[PDB]
Amino acid sequence: ARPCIPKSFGYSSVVCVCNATYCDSFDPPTFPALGTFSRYESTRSGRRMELSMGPIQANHTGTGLLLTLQPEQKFQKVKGFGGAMTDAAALNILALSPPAQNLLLKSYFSEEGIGYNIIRVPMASCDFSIRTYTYADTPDDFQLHNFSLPEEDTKLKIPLIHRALQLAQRPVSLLASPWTSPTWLKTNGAVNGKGSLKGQPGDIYHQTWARYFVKFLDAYAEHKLQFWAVTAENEPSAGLLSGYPFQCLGFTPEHQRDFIARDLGPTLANSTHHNVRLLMLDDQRLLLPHWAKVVLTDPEAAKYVHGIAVHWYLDFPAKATLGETHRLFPNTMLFASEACVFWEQSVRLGSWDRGMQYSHSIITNLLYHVVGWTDWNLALNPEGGPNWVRNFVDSPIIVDITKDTFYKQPMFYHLGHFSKFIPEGSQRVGLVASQKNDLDAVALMHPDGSAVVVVLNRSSKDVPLTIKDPAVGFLETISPGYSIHTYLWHRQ
Ligand SMILES: *[C@@H]1O[C@H](CO)[C@@H](O[C@@H]2O[C@H](CO)[C@@H](O)[C@H](O)[C@H]2NC(C)=O)[C@H](O)[C@H]1NC(C)=O
Ligand SMILES: *[C@@H]1O[C@H](CO[C@@H]2O[C@@H](C)[C@@H](O)[C@@H](O)[C@@H]2O)[C@@H](O)[C@H](O)[C@H]1NC(C)=O
Ligand SMILES: CC(C)CCCS(=O)(=O)C[C@H]1NC[C@@H](O)[C@H](O)[C@H]1O
Numbered sequence: 218a219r220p221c222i223p224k225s226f227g228y229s230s231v232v233c234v235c236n237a238t239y240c241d242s243f244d245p246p247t248f249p250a251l252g253t254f255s256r257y258e259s260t261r262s263g264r265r266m267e268l269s270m271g272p273i274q275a276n277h278t279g280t281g282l283l284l285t286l287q288p289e290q291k292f293q294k295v296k297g298f299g300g301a302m303t304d305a306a307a308l309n310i311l312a313l314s315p316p317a318q319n320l321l322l323k324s325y326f327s328e329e330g331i332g333y334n335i336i337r338v339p340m341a342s343c344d345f346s347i348r349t350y351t352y353a354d355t356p357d358d359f360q361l362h363n364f365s366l367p368e369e370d371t372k373l374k375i376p377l378i379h380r381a382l383q384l385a386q387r388p389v390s391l392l393a394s395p396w397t398s399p400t401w402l403k404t405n406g407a408v409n410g411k412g413s414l415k416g417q418p419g420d421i422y423h424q425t426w427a428r429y430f431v432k433f434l435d436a437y438a439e440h441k442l443q444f445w446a447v448t449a450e451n452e453p454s455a456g457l458l459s460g461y462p463f464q465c466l467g468f469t470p471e472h473q474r475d476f477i478a479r480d481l482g483p484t485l486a487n488s489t490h491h492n493v494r495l496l497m498l499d500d501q502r503l504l505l506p507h508w509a510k511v512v513l514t515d516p517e518a519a520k521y522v523h524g525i526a527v528h529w530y531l532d533f534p535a536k537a538t539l540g541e542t543h544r545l546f547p548n549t550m551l552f553a554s555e556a557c558v559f560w561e562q563s564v565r566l567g568s569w570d571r572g573m574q575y576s577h578s579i580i581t582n583l584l585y586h587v588v589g590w591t592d593w594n595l596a597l598n599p600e601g602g603p604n605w606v607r608n609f610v611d612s613p614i615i616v617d618i619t620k621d622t623f624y625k626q627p628m629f630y631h632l633g634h635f636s637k638f639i640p641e642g643s644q645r646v647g648l649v650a651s652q653k654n655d656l657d658a659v660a661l662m663h664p665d666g667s668a669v670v671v672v673l674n675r676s677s678k679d680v681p682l683t684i685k686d687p688a689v690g691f692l693e694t695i696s697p698g699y700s701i702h703t704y705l706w707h708r709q
Contacts, residue, residue: 218242218329221265224624226566230261232615232624237313240320241265241625242329243637254692254706257638259630261569261699266630266637273706277691281681282654286670287647288662288688288708293586295643295661296552297390298636299335300325300592300613302381305345305603307373309596309616317621319384321614322377324625325595326385331633334387334641336378337554337591338444340395340433342369342408343451344463344606345594349408352433356401359425364432375440387640390445392554392591393433394499394526397464398426404467411459413467418475427476427484434490446494448526448554449473449481454500462606470504470511473497474518482521494523499554501531506542513546526554527587529578539585550588553579557593558628563601563609569699571611572627576673576701579635580657583645592632596623631673634703638669656680656696666708673701 221241223231233241243266249255252273257266277283300306310318324330341351346369353364382389397408402422405412415422434444449468450456456467468476477495485493498508505527513519525542539551556578558571565571579590594612601609613629616622639661648660648670655676661669674680677698684692688708696702
């Protein structure tokens, strides 16, 4: 309905300006007939998911590269895509006028937007908060009688989660992850630094921490929010590093294996939230497949673990990490739970490179059995904050409080090229390249049988392209240099 208002900030591409009265949006999706495809195109030159249509032809005449859909070769099914509503994301969204807040929320979650369906909710504070806190800071409260949600949850996060669910056409899945426990349950008595849980799995300390998970789900159930899954600990390897700055909690793979078997697993099972999934690792895929062997070999731990959560930092091979983990444990899903972008500035408004970084990593993960991808902060300020430590990073939406204006980065549209067109339940199918190429392509099949194919060109040269669907025909197109396309078409 409304196109992108571009602004350049000196980098390789533009941002899309939005405010209280204007933001770019989509019309409700339509169903083009058989023999017709839909194409969404974003380019470094300024095009932003521009819709166009064309024919799927009976035969093909050309000398160029050919991609052939192979629908009979079926792989993993997709859980969904989204981001994390941290304290920082909530503070930056709510700093806008209410009309602008809704245009930001509609951008992510509405079908007028890119249709997110996963929100990662941190349990208490992390580095993207403006203060250290947990839900049970008063010490020696082992039954957790003084467990309570602060204003960060009751005033900021939960209301915004509600409004995002109202605007979403698709069911949204909430995913919780803890950063640190109460300090009186840790070895070093600090919110950060090198330290684990006091004692050994099964004692008063590990039991108290396991029910902290239940008391968290209780508090959100009271606010009428149910969770799809929780992770055992956000980056538990970080809590083993000497002098770690953010909130953390140390777990060796054997420690996480025992804490799941003796405490977290049974406690969540004996509770009203027994249907909530438990994901392990929630760390860099570097620690794979070793972390999967330690945990999933113990049947008393593996009986409770529904999947493995991966972070995308420390990636700069996938077949040795994601692929080998799948080969050893093919029935334990892999899920990208966090992602975000040394000499470079924290925020690079309009960076087309960081957009490509998102889409390429999404394509790689999809090609190696990952069932979903989650972004980090939903929104940040032009300095990459607020962050109480220092860790400023980038975000697909940057908020300018002083001008009631937020910018949609190229990262936003690169993820949207997946999140908007690959609904929960889609299955990845084969896509054969006729010859070596510079493109990254992934083919999936909607639950309704239709096809979806994302093609990203990280090279500077235009690549002529043909997509073959054996049931339909030949799709003639061109993938321009520095562009990403999403193709959709019905198969009958
Ligand atoms: C919010 O964004 C919209 C979109 O750019 C702004 O509306 C434009 O205003 C300029 C005036 O400087 C007109 O020339 C454009 O034609 C308008 N675009 C439209 C109507 O689509 C709006 O001004 C912005 N808000 C503020 C306070 O500046
Ligand atoms: C697509 O084309 C095939 C080859 O067509 C023949 O060769 C080309 C070079 C032209 O000379 C053309 O006039 C010839 O008929 C066809 O045999 C094939 O049937 C066509 N496929 C479909 C689905 O129509
Ligand atoms: C300062 C650290 C020593 C950098 C390395 C570890 S890290 O995991 O890459 C940080 C990322 N993941 C954890 C999030 O809380 C954090 O905000 C995000 O930037």
